[PDB]
Amino acid sequence: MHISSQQHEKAIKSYFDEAQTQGVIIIKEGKNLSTYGNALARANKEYVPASTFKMLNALIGLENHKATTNEIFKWDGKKRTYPAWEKDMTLGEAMALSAVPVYQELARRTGLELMQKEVKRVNFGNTNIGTQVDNFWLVGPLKITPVQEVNFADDLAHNRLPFKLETQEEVKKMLLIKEVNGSKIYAKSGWGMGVTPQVGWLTGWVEQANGKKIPFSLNLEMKEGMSGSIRNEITYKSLENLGII
Numbered sequence: 001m002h003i004s005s006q007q008h009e010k011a012i013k014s015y016f017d018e019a020q021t022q023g024v025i026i027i028k029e030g031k032n033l034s035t036y037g038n039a040l041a042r043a044n045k046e047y048v049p050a051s052t053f054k055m056l057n058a059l060i061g062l063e064n065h066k067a068t069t070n071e072i073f074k075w076d077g078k079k080r081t082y083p084a085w086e087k088d089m090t091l092g093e094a095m096a097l098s099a100v101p102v103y104q105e106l107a108r109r110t111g112l113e114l115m116q117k118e119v120k121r122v123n124f125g126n127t128n129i130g131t132q133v134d135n136f137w138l139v140g141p142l143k144i145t146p147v148q149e150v151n152f153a154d155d156l157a158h159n160r161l162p163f164k165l166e167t168q169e170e171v172k173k174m175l176l177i178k179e180v181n182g183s184k185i186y187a188k189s190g191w192g193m194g195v196t197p198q199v200g201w202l203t204g205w206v207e208q209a210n211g212k213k214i215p216f217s218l219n220l221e222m223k224e225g226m227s228g229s230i231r232n233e234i235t236y237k238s239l240e241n242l243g244i245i
């Protein structure tokens with residue numbers, strides 16, 4: 001179409017500039033990776049996955065029968081960092097709320113030995129989980145690049161990960177976050193709150209009406225008093241500017 005690549009690049013860069021952060025959004029169309037934003041060198045740098053790891057945590061737990069999709073993880077009655085976590089929920093509900101405590105219970109059921117083997121088997125990021133089964137995705141040592149995250153999303157969107165088809169479909173059902181004029185957006189957000197600087201992620205794919213799937217990964221620096229929803233807003237504006245939604 002008739003908009004120049006120079007104009008697309010400038011527009012998407014301006015979304016990051018206007019949020020007063022530094023970031024990149026990687027788009028994959030077929031095999032071709034396109035990098036946009038205001039800090040392109042972030043594309044092959046390593047960051048903690050933070051809550052984007054919930055996608056893989058869920059695959060591993062379901063594959064290894066550590067939970068079912070209808071199982072209700074009970075709230076233990078203790079005060080949580082966020083009040084909306086103070087309730088009983090399924091893995092899918094916990095995905096949408098990014099309820100760390102539920103996914104920490106799942107990681108503990110899986111256990112360190114099995115978790116390390118599965119993370120190696122999938123070859124996710126730097127593949128190192130260290131010795132602490134319940135926080136390795138939050139504070140290190142596990143790290144991943146935005147290129148690696150968009151390639152993970154590409155794999156999951158096309159059922160190419162080494163898990164059963166049914167497992168992948170169950171996790172994909174948990175990730176629907178927006179529907180825009182016949183396009184569906186499947187994604188998981190991430191916010192590394194226990195690292196400095198703090199990393200923000202939104203990793204997923206657009207499923208267009210025609211069936212084509214376009215993976216993406218947004219990566220940026222989360223700064224003092226930014227809203228979580230800036231990740232979503234920059235992402236939707238960028239995908240809209242490119243005509244993907």
Ligand SMILES: *[B]([O])([O])C1=[C][C]=C(S(=O)(=O)N2[C][C][C]2)[C]=[C]1
Pocket residue numbers: 050051052081098100138189190191192193194
């Ligand atoms: B996630 O990236 O959406 C996510 C990570 C960490 C936290 S947390 O710092 O509030 N937490 C409770 C124990 C670690 C929330 C969300």
Ligand SMILES: O=S(=O)(c1ccc(B(O)O)cc1)N1CCC1
Pocket residue numbers: 051082097098099189190191226227228229
């Ligand atoms: O995705 S999160 O990191 C997240 C964290 C903070 C906000 B906010 O108050 O603007 C939104 C989402 N998360 C923790 C609970 C959901």
